[PDB]
Amino acid sequence: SSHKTFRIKRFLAKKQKQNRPIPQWIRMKTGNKIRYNSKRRHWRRTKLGL
Amino acid sequence: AKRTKKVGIVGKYGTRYGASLRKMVKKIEISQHAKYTCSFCGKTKMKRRAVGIWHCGSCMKTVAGGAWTYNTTSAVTVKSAIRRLKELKDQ
Amino acid sequence: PRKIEEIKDFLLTARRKDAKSVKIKKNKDNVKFKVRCSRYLYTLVITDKEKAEKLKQSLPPGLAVKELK
Amino acid sequence: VQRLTYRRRLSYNTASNKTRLSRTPGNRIVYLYTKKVGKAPKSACGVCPGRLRGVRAVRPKVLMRLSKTKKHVSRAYGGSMCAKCVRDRIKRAFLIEEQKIVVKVLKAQAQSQK
Amino acid sequence: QVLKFTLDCTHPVEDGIMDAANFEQFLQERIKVNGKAGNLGGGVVTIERSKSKITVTSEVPFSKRYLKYLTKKYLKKNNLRDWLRVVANSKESYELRYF
RNA sequence: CGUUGCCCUCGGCCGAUCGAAAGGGAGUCGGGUUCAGAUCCCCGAAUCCGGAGUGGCGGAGAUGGGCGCCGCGAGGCGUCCAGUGCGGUAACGCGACCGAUCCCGGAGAAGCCGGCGGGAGCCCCGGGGAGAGUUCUCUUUUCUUUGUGAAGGGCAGGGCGCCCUGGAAUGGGUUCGCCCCGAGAGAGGGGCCCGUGCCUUGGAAAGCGUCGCGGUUCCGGCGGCGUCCGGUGAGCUCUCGCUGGCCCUUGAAAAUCCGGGGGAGAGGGUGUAAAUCUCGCGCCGGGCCGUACCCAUAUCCGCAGCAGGUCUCCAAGGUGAACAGCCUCUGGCAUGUUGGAACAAUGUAGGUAAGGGAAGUCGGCAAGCCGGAUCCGUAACUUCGGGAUAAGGAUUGGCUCUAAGGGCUGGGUCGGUCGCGGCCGGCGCCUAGCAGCCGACUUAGAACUGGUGCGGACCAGGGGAAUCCGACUGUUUAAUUAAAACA
RNA sequence: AGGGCGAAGCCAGAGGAAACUCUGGUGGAGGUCCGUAGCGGUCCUGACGUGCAAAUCGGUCGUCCGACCUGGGUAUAGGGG
Ligand SMILES: [Mg+2]
Ligand SMILES: [Mg+2]
Ligand SMILES: [Mg+2]
Ligand SMILES: [Mg+2]
Ligand SMILES: [Mg+2]
Ligand SMILES: [Mg+2]
Ligand SMILES: [Mg+2]
Ligand SMILES: [Mg+2]
Ligand SMILES: [Mg+2]
Ligand SMILES: [Mg+2]
Ligand SMILES: [Mg+2]
Ligand SMILES: [Mg+2]
Ligand SMILES: [Mg+2]
Ligand SMILES: [Mg+2]
Ligand SMILES: [Mg+2]
Ligand SMILES: [Mg+2]
Ligand SMILES: [Mg+2]
Ligand SMILES: [Mg+2]
Ligand SMILES: [Mg+2]
Ligand SMILES: [Mg+2]
Ligand SMILES: [Mg+2]
Ligand SMILES: [Mg+2]
Ligand SMILES: [Zn+2]
């Protein structure tokens, strides 16, 4: 909005940190079932806890 | 009767509202916009400000009067009676 | 800012503790004398050139006298 | 023609968001936001409609800054009340007290008579 | 008053691209005064010749950049507006130069 | 001298608290700078608020007057009082000018609409420059560009329901409109407020425009020149101001800030004090959170880059009544999720049609006619206001002329004397005014002219006679009912 | 936006013995008219009708100083508003 509270800004920050894709060294771990992050949120489609 | 034969002040209203109502309004509509004489300085400046309150512009004397006239008749008749009784009581 | 009218007055303002740079703008036909202070930037317009050249010498202990060009 | 924008996030044209055009040294017309218009104080009498003389009509929280002389005038009731209403108050307050004295005298004569 | 405008064409003439006498002649023809082309409006403006430098010397009010116009017109006629450019060298002066 | 403990002394409130990124609410602006941030970074100019004890400094308070001596005199001492600033007839003024609880007042703090005026921004016109484009012919060309922040100081320019003089009917003054006057008009002199306008400090050093160099480079390099003068206005935008109109409508509170009335107190004793709603300068501080971008025929909501929806600011030239439409510059785009080749039928959206003119159809549905302006001319009926652009007519282009509408400035000339200018005295006294100099724009009339075309595109009423319903304006079924329903 | 109509009040002139009346102005009233933005939504029973759209589009329309339009804040909740 460009007029944020601090509460909201911090919320957004964490959401922004969560988006990154898996580190590829994770795929090489021993008992690995994970191939892709599957919790990736694109701003244009799917619109936050808000 | 330069511009109108018989509407004057209530020519504003045009055709609307009916003849009787517009005739009925003409009496008040005149009196309420009249500039009266400030019985305080004697200039012709007593002008209704809002209902029941008339203000002299020069005198600066705001005066609780009638709704459409600086004086109602009722007020006037009441004034004289009170003056009479006042004199009857005190002597 | 503040303009000054007496050569003495600007000399007194220049002699304060708070003062510093006393830069000097030769405009042609004018020769200002801008002396910064804490609050204000005092200037003084000295129309004569020789009188400005004389004043140049009369600033006191080793102030900046940062002549402007 | 150089059109222009507001300089603050207040978009709406309001009592708060009033402006004026100014040409800068950079040679660009720019909005400067303008300070509200202060009023001179009206009289303590309350009949004289005209506002007071010799007072800097300025937004009241400024008065703080101003010198005492700007804020008033050298008279009794200075910068609170218009002169006319003082010199009527004066002679009123005097003339009233002279009649109060006259009634006191007429009372004292009536006591001495009775 | 004395309005004295030079119009020096030093190194187009030295390269031999134009002739200053013909340019003078063209200027004596054209330079209009009060809406009359020929005869310099009588003995009003005066055109000088100094190999390269032209000088125009008026008594009446006379614009400087009217000389720029007429040089530009003359340069177009001779097909020189391509590698010749009029510039104000200084005030009271123009100056034909290359690119 | 602080700090605290206790004792006395005084004290109404009014409800704790929450409630506005458009209400109220002190104080920041110019230039530069980034791949992306700037009133936030840098440079420079400011500014408010709080603190400032020991008070950092000046200045104000405040340094008179008397008497007595001594000294030629300037003056020196002894001793007595005065001194919480002064100016103006007044409006009110001057840099400061003690002061509590208490009280009164003001500011914050006010609707809409009209008209008129002043100030800016923009547009326009005439010229100066600098760079342009055009140049077959013409064009002293057409195009661009031509600057000064806040805060101070000065001065115009506005406004005053301020004062003093004085006394107005033959009544005057005066507005576009009004409106004012013995409760003091005109006339003369002043006082105050705003001064966003000029000038100036700021500030040319900075910006912009040009020409030019320095550097293979890096480089915010460095120089020249310039940044001028005038005129216009029912012009538009904003604004300040005055003055009306409307209301059975009268159009926010509070925080905060000041003024005044009071006079409880405090100050030192003749060089100083307490005091500065402190004057000028000096010192220190201002934490917390927001600050990217989109803001919409692709960043929002309608399952989507959806013809939908979604609150504002700015707002050039031409034509024109116009923020109408049509064309243009500034700025912006690539035709709205594709291309190519054809040009069949059906369509969707536009047009045109001989003769007739509603014969069509439930029904003139649809389209067509009409349309602007000026000049004439205007019925029935009527609640006398309307009806009314009733109806019905005529004109309209281009060109070349005519007439009619305004402002400014100027005579005190002759004689004398003093320095073209002044001062004095006498004539003159345009008192029917005349002379020179400027500048918007309209209106009417006339000639000529064209293949009768001319509101040439754009914009832009079809009328009439009657009946029914509902007086009217208003409202209504979001998404089949706008009505005669509701009001 | 821009236009139209031109109510009270005001001026002058003319008449009138008076009462007052005419003529020309000025003035700018109104849930006044035209008409933009705005708000709406008549008709084409047009387009569309597996749409652009779970109600949109085009022209044509109503209204456009007032019972006007509109943002944000705030109040009223289910036999309840
Ligand atoms: Mg979305
Ligand atoms: Mg606000
Ligand atoms: Mg004062
Ligand atoms: Mg709160
Ligand atoms: Mg007078
Ligand atoms: Mg931003
Ligand atoms: Mg936009
Ligand atoms: Mg296409
Ligand atoms: Mg394409
Ligand atoms: Mg698209
Ligand atoms: Mg046919
Ligand atoms: Mg049939
Ligand atoms: Mg038939
Ligand atoms: Mg039809
Ligand atoms: Mg009819
Ligand atoms: Mg019947
Ligand atoms: Mg109805
Ligand atoms: Mg419906
Ligand atoms: Mg419908
Ligand atoms: Mg259909
Ligand atoms: Mg289909
Ligand atoms: Mg599409
Ligand atoms: Zn008073």
DSSP letters, E2-22, are -EEEE-B-HHHHTTTSS-HHH
How many whole angstroms from B19 Cα to the centroid of ligand 15?
22
One-letter amino acid at B23 equals K
d(CA E82, CA A19): 62
Q: Which residues, 6 or more positions from D19, have their beta carbon under 8 angstroms from its beta carbon?
A: D6, D31, D32, D33, D34
CA distance D29 to D26: 9
Count CA within 13 A, CB hemisphere, residue C48. Answer: 8
- Give the residue among E14, E85, E95 at the shortest CA–CA distance from E51: E14
Please give the distance of CA E72 from its chain centroid, rounded to a whole number: 9
Which segments of chain C does DSSP mark as H helices, in order?
7-14, 49-57
Distance from the Cα of D91 to chain B's closest Cα (Å) equals 20
- Chain B: nearest CA to D47, how far in angstroms? 6
Helices and strands (DSSP H and E) totals, chain E? 3, 5
**Chain B contact set for D48 (CB, 8 A):** 60
Distance CA A16, CA D66 (A): 52
Say which experimental method was used: cryo-EM
* Helix-helix angle E20-30:E66-77, to 10 degrees: 120
The H or E element containing residue A31 is none
Question: Which residue does chain B place closest to D48, by CA atoms?
Answer: B60
Does residue A45 sit in helix, strand or coil? strand
Q: Is C33 exposed, middle or buried (0-12, 13-18, 19+ CB in 10 A)?
A: buried
CA distance B89 to B83: 10
Chain C touching partners, 3 or more CB pairs below 8 A: none
Chain F bases closer than 7 A to any CB of the protein:
21-32, 39, 44-50, 85-88, 90-97, 104-110, 120-123, 127-137, 139-141, 146-152, 160-163, 180-181, 183, 191-197, 200-208, 210-212, 223, 225-226, 238-241, 245-250, 256-262, 277-283, 289-295, 299-301, 304-305, 311-316, 383-386, 471-472
Resolution of the entry in angstroms: 9.1
B49 in contact with chain D, both atoms CB, cutoff 8 A = no
C-alpha to C-alpha distances, E64 to C43, E47, E70, E89, E91, nearest whole angstrom: 40, 14, 11, 13, 9
The answer to whether the annotation marks B38 as part of a ligand binding site is yes
Rounded distance in angstroms from the CA atom of residue D69 to the C1' atom of nucleotide F353 = 92
- Phi-psi sector, D54: left (phi>0), alpha (psi -120 to 50), beta: left
Tokens at residue D4, please? 């222009």
> Which stretches of chain D sit within 8 Å of chain B by CB?
47-49
Q: What is the dihedral of CA C29, C35, C41, C46, to 10 degrees?
A: -20
Strand order, beta sheet including B62-64? B46-50, B53-56, B62-64
Q: How far is B62 from chain D (nearest CA, A)?
A: 10
Strand F close to E21 by CB, under 7 A: no
The reply to whether B53 Cβ lies less than 7 angstroms from strand F is no
| Alpha carbon of C10 to ligand 11 centroid (Å) | 99
CA dist D6 to A29, D16, D17, Å? 57, 12, 9
For residues D41 and D51, the answer to whether their CB atoms sit within 8 Å is yes
3-state secondary structure of B6: coil
